[PDB]
Design a protein around this nucleic acid. Structure first.
Lengths: 64, 140, 67, 143, 143, 140, 68, 63
DNA sequence: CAAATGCTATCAAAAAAAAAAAATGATAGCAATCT
DNA sequence: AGATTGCTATCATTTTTTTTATTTTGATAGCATTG
């Protein structure tokens, strides 16, 4: 999906640009990661059910 | 600070998964559950040892895209320090009559370095290494 | 400035829409904020104001040209 | 990254600092701003040439104990490689009328190697150096 | 670089240590030799298992105060990446005949990542892992 | 050690090179002779400002394959530390009536940094900057 | 163990040929020695003999196997 | 421009191979560079003359 | 002598350049919402 | 009812990724000539 951020404070932009490069990422990828991490937090994964699902989907397995 | 053992993490994936273990895994804060590289290596091998077919391929897909990414950053490595712990744990038990499989010792020493609670079906080995343990096949 | 974030997973995207809604604002307002806070956190020192103070401390100085 | 020339970093310290400039300096991430050893030479000489008294002393401390340390690790030297760029930045300017002075060449040259942008009040010269410049005194528009 | 497997690093410490092996270890430059965390573990446990006495105390000291320190920074952990490699090195060998023991897979896998050469007396396994191997018990011919 | 000011290191190249300066440069142990990036910058610029041609092309060739490689590793950078020295050197001399060209200042400072004897035909400046000087136009 | 060196500066060659003649060696022998010399310099420690000593100090050990 | 080194102590060979990779260059470049450094240390350049000639070689210049 | 040298060679892998494909960074243009 | 917002799009770069040449190593093989 695409998203346009306008009227972004100049400084806030300089700062993000900094984080991105200082980590070897393009600014765009940086923001993309940031928003990604936030989603990650907001979410509470159901580990048990998550797998048992993937297992019921592939007819179940036994990885020893 | 919970460290899943191979047999635990892989329980839900089984044919007749134990619903008690699934429920337990479903009661955890993912940002607090770890894995040993040794354990991830065992899972990855389990997948890799499957006969070629759609099955092996979808599983691999998930394993790398869905399952494993959830522990990214928390897959503990077996290094020098931990190797010293391993030696203690195993040499100790062994010289007191309780055997500890290398496989187990690795997880054990790891858990032991960060004071973590090993979650497993075979608690004997870990009680022996003096490591907090939790058998998810039970309650409480 | 402006920036377009292409190839943003619908998951993350929906997460951010949700966040914004819950927070009572627009998504563009939410991202603008999320970024702002981060930026605020990196802004350890403010060079201008920092130097300004010094100026104000000695009542300003005009340094010889030299070059 | 941004390389601050002498006149820009001098502004805030003046009697009536230029509002627009200070604000600009304020919108930056310190770790992104750098200084050429040359510019540092100048700032220190500019200080040293003052008349002896309180002002000078205070400013000296501020300079060594406050300003410069913020740039530790980011004060760029004029080393052998930079020299090559230098020789070409100036030569190329002379064969295009617009002359560039040694000092400006040093700074420019430095900036160019590390592919940076010079923030100066006198963009006049630097453009002829084939290097990105920015006048914090002016405004910013469209592209 | 070379990765020493347990059994080689042990050879010299033994009663009548194979001379050919000790000769080869001396023809080496320390900074080039590495150990796997797995291997250190094995060594560390092999010591711990000796009956309590003088021999075990000294060996334990020399072991931790002399030997090991010499590989500081050159002791390779079995991290997540290495695991992926391990997964293939083993599944591969199996669907090809010669099966590999996990321990040996850890070492191989480790070595492979950094494309190192495994020095072991038991080469019979590693070669099946597509990793370069060398037996210091044997003679060098090389073409 | 010895740092060659720009004018000395470039004399031999001049049309009718002064023999006293050439002969002295010949008595030196290359491994003890240095150059300042500043000086190296003007040398290179000197070559750049020549009309493209055999002369310029060869001079350049020789300057990069035959001359500078001789100083590889001994071409002193103008850095922060030096900048401070430069500031003291010029401030003192200047607030005492002896103008020190910023040009010469960069060298005197480089020299004053590592305790070197500067070689130059402009002895006057350097004496004022408190740096060992030597005029290769004379003898001894 | 043998190795070739092509595109060797012609000046460097003579310099080495010279140094060899100065000493009573052949050029190859001189290379071998200027090489062997720096090599011995890299040799900070001899792992083999090192571990051996440790072995002799304790009369030698025989660690258990421990490995499936 | 070409030299062959035989009967070379496989170990001295190791030492070199090592210094080679550590500096990111082929073993050969290494020998070449080593020999090159030797020659330079055996040489005494006369800075004055060496320039004085490059000078007369191009009709003289000034910087 | 046979062993050692000094040169030229082979010869199969490793170790700059030319082309092709992504992203990135800057806005630009609207229809549908909120103020 | 003018500003904001959500979605797409244009476009001149950067940045990667992939192909296609060229060079260089490795390693050791001929051959005519001194400890």
């Amino acid at each position: 999906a695409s998203v346009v951020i306008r009227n972004l404070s100049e400084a806030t932009h300089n700062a993000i640009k900094f984080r991105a490069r200082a980590a070897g990422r393009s600014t765009e990828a940086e923001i993309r990661l940031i928003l990604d991490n936030i989603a990650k937090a907001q979410q509470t994964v159901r580990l048990g059910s998550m797998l048992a699902s993937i297992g019921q989907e592939i007819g179940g397995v036994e990885l020893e | 600070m919970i460290l899943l053992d191979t047999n635990v993490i892989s329980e839900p994936l089984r044919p007749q998964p134990n619903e008690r273990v699934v429920a337990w895994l479903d009661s955890l804060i993912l940002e607090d559950v770890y894995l040993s590289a040794i354990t991830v290596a065992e899972m990855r091998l389990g997948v890799a040892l499957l006969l070629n077919g759609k099955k092996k391929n979808v599983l691999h897909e998930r394993m790398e895209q869905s399952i494993l990414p959830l522990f990214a950053g928390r897959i503990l490595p077996f290094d020098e320090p931990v190797a010293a712990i391993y030696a203690q744990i195993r040499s100790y038990a062994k010289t007191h009559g309780k055997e500890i499989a290398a496989a187990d010792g690795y997880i054990a020493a790891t858990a032991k370095q960060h004071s973590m609670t090993v979650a497993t079906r075979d608690t004997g080995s870990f009680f022996a290494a003096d490591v907090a343990v939790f058998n998810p096949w039970h309650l409480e």
